Amino acid sequence: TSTEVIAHHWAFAIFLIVAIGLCCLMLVGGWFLGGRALSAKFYLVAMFFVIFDVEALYLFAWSTSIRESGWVGFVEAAIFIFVLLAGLVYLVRIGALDWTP
Amino acid sequence: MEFAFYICGLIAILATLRVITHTNPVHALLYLIISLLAISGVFFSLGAYFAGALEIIVYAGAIMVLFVFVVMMLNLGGSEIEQERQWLKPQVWIGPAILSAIMLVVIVYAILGVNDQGIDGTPISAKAVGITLFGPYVLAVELASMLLLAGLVVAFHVGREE
Amino acid sequence: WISPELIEILLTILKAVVILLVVVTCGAFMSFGERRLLGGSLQLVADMIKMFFKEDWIPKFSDRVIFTLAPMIAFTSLLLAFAIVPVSPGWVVADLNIGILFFLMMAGLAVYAVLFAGWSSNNKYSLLGAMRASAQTLSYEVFLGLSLMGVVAQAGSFNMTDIVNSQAHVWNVIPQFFGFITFAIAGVAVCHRHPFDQPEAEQELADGYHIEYSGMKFGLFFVGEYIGIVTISALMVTLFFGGWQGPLLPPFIWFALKTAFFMMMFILIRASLPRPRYDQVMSFGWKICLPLTLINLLVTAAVILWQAQ
Amino acid sequence: MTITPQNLIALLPLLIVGLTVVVVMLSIAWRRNHFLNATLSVIGLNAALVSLWFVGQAGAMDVTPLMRVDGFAMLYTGLVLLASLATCTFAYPWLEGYNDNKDEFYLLVLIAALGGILLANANHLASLFLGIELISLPLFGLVGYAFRQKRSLEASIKYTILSAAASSFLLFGMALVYAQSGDLSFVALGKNLGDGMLNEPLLLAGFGLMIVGLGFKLSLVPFHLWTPDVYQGAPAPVSTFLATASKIAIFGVVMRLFLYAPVGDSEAIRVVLAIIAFASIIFGNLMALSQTNIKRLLGYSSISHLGYLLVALIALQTGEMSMEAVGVYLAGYLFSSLGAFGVVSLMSSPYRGPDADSLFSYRGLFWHRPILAAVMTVMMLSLAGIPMTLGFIGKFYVLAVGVQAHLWWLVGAVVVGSAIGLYYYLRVAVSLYLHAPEQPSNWQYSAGGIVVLISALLVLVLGVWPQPLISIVRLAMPLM
Amino acid sequence: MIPLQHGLILAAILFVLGLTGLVIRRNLLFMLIGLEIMINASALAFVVAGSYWGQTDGQVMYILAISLAAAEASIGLALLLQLHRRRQNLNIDSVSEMRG
Ligand SMILES: CCCCCCCCCCCCCCCCCC(=O)OC[C@H](COP(=O)(O)OCCN)OC(=O)CCCCCCCCCCCCCCCCC
Ligand SMILES: CCCCCCCCCCCCCCCCCC(=O)OC[C@H](COP(=O)(O)OCCN)OC(=O)CCCCCCCCCCCCCCCCC
Ligand SMILES: CCCCCCCCCCCCCCCCCC(=O)OC[C@H](COP(=O)(O)OCCN)OC(=O)CCCCCCCCCCCCCCCCC
Ligand SMILES: CCCCCCCCCCCCCCCCCC(=O)OC[C@H](COP(=O)(O)OCCN)OC(=O)CCCCCCCCCCCCCCCCC
Ligand SMILES: CCCCCCCCCCCCCCCCCC(=O)OC[C@H](COP(=O)(O)OCCN)OC(=O)CCCCCCCCCCCCCCCCC
Ligand SMILES: CCCCCCCCCCCCCCCCCCCC
Ligand SMILES: CCCCCCCCCCCCCCCCCCCC
């Protein structure tokens, strides 16, 4: 409820509103003005991205509290990263990540 | 923080209602992305900042990308279901709509009558979620890694082309 | 109707509006500088007038909502991702607790620009080019966050002001060097910039997804890309080069100098470094940069926990 | 709380199975070898059994806020590991007939066994949800392993869609329970209630949606319709695993949840589970009456047998030997289903391709497979609750448990359903010995035959002499 | 000052709408979409419950929920691609050869 916090909230709201309005108004002006007269490897890559992004979010949560988690948290994240790297090595070696076989 | 919650919840409800009654897959996925943005706004209104961040990053930003990838890869151009449009015929949707409405009234009756001092909205940071995640929920983290590994292996074994 | 709280609110609102306007005009001037190096403000005014007064023609067999929506994503995604960047003490738009997470949210939304443009542009070659471009940017967004996570691990928070204050003594480019190079690579690849310029150029089955975009939609794509370079450079400065921190100059002068230096470095990277093959790019990403970011985070955590007595 | 070295030695089957998953994956990445990767998987599972011995040498304690290891956990972990080992043994000749990659099968089997171990040790809603999902997703892969075959792909799609819906139901019910009760541990689901206010509407509704998810997973009526389709369409070792290990692990975590939760002795939940048990027994036995397909018949059979087990669960808060009855019945059901689905697997192995039919054709099996016919008729007698078989010992335990708790409708349901079971089980067992007009050579096929023969001998010997099994299940006591 | 009942009711509304979309839609892709709506509603309910009690367990439950949603979405879309490649038809009623 600080005045700095509410001022920054208002500034963020005005930033988003004015930015989206600027883009929309620029397209509106562009439209109104002026006269008139597949392979499955894409799925594989996107699916690998989704899986590795969820494992990335796990590491995202770990990274902000490494000191509070101590060495036992380091050991757990090391097991997590080793399993993730084993899966990555598996995908590379079986040709799943090889774009040109 | 109450106004944000109510408008975002209303936007989410309207968006998924337009998701389930739409014919174009890309339009349905777009309304689904709008619903996920609104639900992340609901998360931010409640103080679950990490949850809203992951809702935009992962749910609206990775999984919906996979859905859009699949839709543009299969090239749905009205394969005998768009021209049929059976889900908007009353004899098809009236049954499940009453069934889901009955389930909604039963669940909502259960929701009411529970003691409720209100959600405070105090932010629960990604710091505390990370502390809990690698503290009392270590096995959840490791076995969730194995779960995502299983999903990876299954989706590779089925979904590859050859 | 005079109160110092309200004066503070409108002063912060004016600061945010000034930051926004400087970012858009600076992206336009980046467009002019790249066009010239490879008056000028009057030339950009003339170009903007031409985009205004040229007829905007949506294709008849194209979905209008998706077609119009893709340039708004290509502009607004990274132009809103700028909002967490602190350019000076007391000159930040939002002091978010999530911060660099908000940058990740905006990049994740930014992939929909290329996907939506390729789908709405009713052309099979444009669709395949969009699939290739989206596969590339997903292949580099897969490690963008972890290359950031090394810095987040050192600072102990997601807040950008806390990251900058943690770079008070030593800038993060020295300890988080591999995070720095991976973030530079992934930030170039996310903005679809050289050497990740045209993934559709490796095949005659693929065409650009900027094709069939004419007028202010093409202008929106161009200015959004250049604004993306501006905000990627500013985030690189605030994450790896102390942000506004410097010995003698005013803080905004140091931030502007570092941002301009990285902008021109991206210009010379486009002008000098050649274009690799598509499979080479995806292989490099998935097989080098992601394990490098994971090992960098592990080593960073071990160093942090070791130096805690 | 943290993880001590004592917590590590209690965690040993989970750690060994996870390390086996990693080692098997790295061996797959190094070179695609069927024999060595199957050997590594079965070595990891046998090492997990010996790890269970080492866990038994340690004490019973809470390894996490999430896991609790006791004799209950050791018993159900051993059951899951035995089912996984038998699935690998049955899977090798069938995969030898396969043409595509045949080691991701073993990776998925190991991950599903890891989920089974987690469900055996699950003391939390977290570990319950995660164990259910870790069972389900590798089974999505395994059910549609031969996706080129039409029936396997159809069973995969049905199981995937319905299990995703069931996991959504279970997760929403968990969320409602957590909304009512501020803790997610099993012991705390209903602690903040008193003076006869155990029937909180939100706690009951959340437990009902969890009942929907768990009753999908246990093939309980009316969440049973997927069972014959997924059983028939899946590969036969996958049918073996889905019949044994998934049901055993999920029913064990349901035992521990209803034993620990203070709302587990709610009258409304007891009446709803009694209705589901009655309907499950009657409906499964009635629906297996006119089946010419052996796998659909075993699916409806699983519906009825899980109804009998649910009857044994209803008396958990009234009698004392409910856990004992569930353990004995689950050992007997495990060995019976292992034998029956193993005969079906051995006669469907090697794989004949996606185009060729995979019909069992059990009529006249004795004239060319006499030992397999004897094993299959021993299983058919055991699943019918015939005395001299272990299935009768389980049925006797269920009947004693129901009689103690005065569950007369359930006891009559068991009697009626048992008579209907007698009809269709004896139809199969006597069709084995009729005459049919018309319609191996490696040690892994012989190993599968040895497995089904040892299952037959175990069923016969423990039906005649059930005291060692009763003594084993009695000392596998959970925390009171 | 937001009631827990309102967040739970919103989650129930979203769950019901997702289940309705899963039932009434004959296209397999829209069934998968309704499944995502259902599991996202469940995760929203867990977040609302955790934010009422002031505990981090709701967001951890959300994290496990979206891990399941990601993995099961990848599996479902692989099965959808296999069905389209085998039959050139996304009809969930046509894949019904197995019957009682
Ligand atoms: C107006 C009518 C409708 C017009 C069209 C729709 C436009 C979008 C409407 C929904 C989004 C904006 C809702 C209004 C938010 C205004 C800001 C606000 O209420 O802030 C309060 C709170 C600040 O945080 P806190 O610190 O807790 O505040 C207490 C004081 N300390 O804030 C918070 O805690 C979080 C605030 C919400 C989270 C950020 C915004 C999420 C936006 C989601 C957009 C979804 C897609 C919308 C699509 C629209 C077109 C269909
Ligand atoms: C065509 C239009 C489509 C829709 C466009 C967007 C619709 C909404 C536009 C209006 C937004 C109104 C203002 C919203 C509130 C801003 C302030 C805010 O969110 O404050 C809450 C919180 C503060 O956190 P903090 O300061 O760290 O802690 C204070 C302690 N209480 O801070 C947070 O929680 C910050 C995190 C939430 C930020 C949300 C930003 C907007 C997201 C939408 C981006 C759209 C991108 C382009 C389209 C994508 C595809 C559709
Ligand atoms: C023979 C008839 C048929 C039997 C079928 C059984 C099927 C399930 C197989 C696994 C069952 C494991 C059950 C373990 C229950 C242990 C309960 C317990 O508390 O045991 C305690 C005891 C040590 O005693 P105590 O001094 O109390 O220790 C604690 C002091 N701190 O600790 C122990 O006693 C340790 C027990 C170790 C068990 C190791 C099992 C190895 C594998 C055996 C497989 C047998 C073959 C079955 C299948 C054949 C092929 C189909
Ligand atoms: C289709 C075939 C199967 C049919 C269904 C299964 C059998 C159904 C039997 C129904 C029995 C109804 C009993 C009604 C009263 C129950 C409550 C009560 O007060 O019971 C009395 C008593 C328990 O009270 P307590 O204080 O412990 O007294 C002990 C001394 N009696 O109770 C006791 O001590 C025990 C009571 C035992 C009751 C009889 C159990 C054996 C039944 C034999 C077979 C069924 C009847 C004959 C066949 C009918 C046609 C098929
Ligand atoms: C006097 C009253 C008091 C005493 C009651 C005592 C009850 C227990 C002892 C008596 C049990 C009587 C059972 C009568 C049916 C015997 C089974 C039978 O007839 O099987 C042969 C028949 C197959 O021959 P078919 O007709 O050619 O086949 C057509 C399908 N292909 O099979 C079929 O057609 C299908 C068989 C279905 C399964 C068997 C029937 C189960 C019926 C319920 C059993 C429990 C009955 C409880 C009491 C009921 C009322 C008396
Ligand atoms: C606070 C200082 C601690 C120093 C010693 C740290 C190392 C000893 C404790 C290790 C605990 C490891 C727990 C790992 C669990 C992995 C579970 C995997 C399941 C598949
Ligand atoms: C590429 C650079 C983008 C910058 C965007 C924001 C511009 C804000 C301008 C602020 C100027 C005043 C800063 C505070 C006073 C200290 C410096 C005084 C001399 C300029």
Ligand SMILES: CCCCCCCCCCCCCCCCCCCC
């Ligand atoms: C102790 C086990 C009891 C149940 C199993 C029954 C099977 C025993 C072994 C096989 C017996 C085969 C008998 C076949 C007789 C066929 C006669 C045909 C000509 C009249």
Ligand SMILES: CCCCCCCCCCCCCCCCCCCC
């Ligand atoms: C379609 C198959 C139907 C099978 C029905 C089986 C029913 C068996 C008989 C049940 C009898 C229950 C008697 C209950 C008496 C309770 C008396 C309580 C006194 C306080």
